[PDB]
């Protein structure tokens, strides 16, 4: 089960000595809803071929989201492409607050609570690149502590330890219910 979405459809054109040659380009985002993200950019002369190319490229290119239970770990300032997209977690149930392309990519990621803002070049392609880079910039507390050579309690806050323990207990309960 994968989540599919389309963000923008553009009628690109090419010129020859005879006249105008039209073409179609599409960008799609694929995700499993658990924290696995794939982006695809596909070009054709017709929408079905375009979306097929986009889906294939997205299937080729994947990326994993290290989310804590339901939300993001820490605020991230994703500076890439030409747009500035700033992501940070929030209180559970607040919702994934983001623009169009960011909305699509985060919903395909499966996150449920995020605060986002795009600060320039509202173009969908650049926004998607900036969000992907923002997720790449994300760091996870366990291997952050491993890199720093200091144990978890001496690195990460007790509140996020409590949240992680609650998330682990909920995941264990869900696994038990699914097995039974």
């Amino acid at each position: 089960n994968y989540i599919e979405r389309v963000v923008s459809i553009n009628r690109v054109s090419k010129v020859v000595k005879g006249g105008r040659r039209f073409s179609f380009t599409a960008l799609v985002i694929v995700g499993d809803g658990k924290g696995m993200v794939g982006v695809g950019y596909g070009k054709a002369k017709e929408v079905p071929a375009a979306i097929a190319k986009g889906v294939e490229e997205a299937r080729k290119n994947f990326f994993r989201v290290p989310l804590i239970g339901s939300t993001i770990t820490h605020p991230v300032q994703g500076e890439a492409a030409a747009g500035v997209v700033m992501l940070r977690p929030a209180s559970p149930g607040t919702g994934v607050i983001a623009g169009g392309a960011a909305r699509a990519v985060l919903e395909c990621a499966g996150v449920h609570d995020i605060l986002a803002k795009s600060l320039g070049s509202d173009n969908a392609i650049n926004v998607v690149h900036a969000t992907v880079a923002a997720l790449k910039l994300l760091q996870r507390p366990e291997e952050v502590a491993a890199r720093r050579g200091l144990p978890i309690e001496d690195v990460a806050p007790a509140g996020m330890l409590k949240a992680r323990r609650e998330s682990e207990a909920l995941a264990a309960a869900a696994a038990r219910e699914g097995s039974a």
Partner: protein, 200 residues
């Protein structure tokens, strides 16, 4: 002011049943009008408004009313979606419907407005009454003698009584205990879309 027009219009146009017993919806799922079969471009705003209008035309609430529930639910420290679901389910109409004493939300609302119900021995005729924790709902003899109430109370074989609601006897006494969680509430639709649409 309440929508006096046909109720099947909402389900037919919108694409999911609301009352649940609509034969017209299952006969023709497409929206009415000369051109309900025309292809429609996908839109996040279409679907966000779609969830909103499903919710509001399903529970029968007012627009200002529902926005006030939204801001209320936001300002309680608890999770916004669960708070909104409680503050909407706490409407006495929905409570008395899901308790099995009414055949539909509209009929619960009409009977409450006419005032066939007693709350803790106090006269109440307000469809939008608020029910807090550990409250008592009573039904008066003038309404036990009412014929449609008898039909409802000896035909109550509808969806099962929830955890927080329960009836104790033939007098149709409705009691509330605690705050339900979303998982056992298992209400259709998704509050995330509504909260995000009002987050716009």
């Amino acid at each position: 002011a309440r929508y006096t027009g046909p109720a099947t219009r909402k389900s037919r146009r919108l694409g999911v049943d609301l009352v649940g017993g609509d034969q017209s919806f299952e006969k023709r799922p497409y929206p009415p009008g000369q051109h309900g079969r025309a292809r429609i471009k996908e839109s996040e705003y279409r679907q966000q408004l779609q969830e909103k209008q499903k919710a509001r035309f399903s529970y029968g609430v007012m627009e200002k009313q529902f926005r006030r529930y939204y801001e209320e639910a936001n300002r309680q420290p608890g999770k916004t979606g669960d708070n909104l679901l409680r503050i909407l389910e706490s409407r006495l109409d929905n409570v008395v419907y899901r308790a099995g004493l009414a055949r539909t939300r509209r009929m619960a609302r009409q009977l409450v407005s006419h005032g066939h119900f007693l709350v803790n021995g106090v006269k109440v005729d307000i469809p939008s009454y608020r029910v807090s924790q550990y409250d008592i709902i009573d039904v008066k003899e003038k309404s036990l003698n009412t014929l449609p109430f008898q039909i409802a109370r000896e035909t109550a074989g509808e969806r099962p009584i929830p955890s927080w609601l329960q009836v104790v006897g033939e007098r149709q006494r409705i009691l509330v205990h605690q705050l339900p969680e979303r998982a056992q509430i298992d209400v259709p639709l998704t509050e995330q879309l509504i909260v995000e649409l009002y987050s716009k």
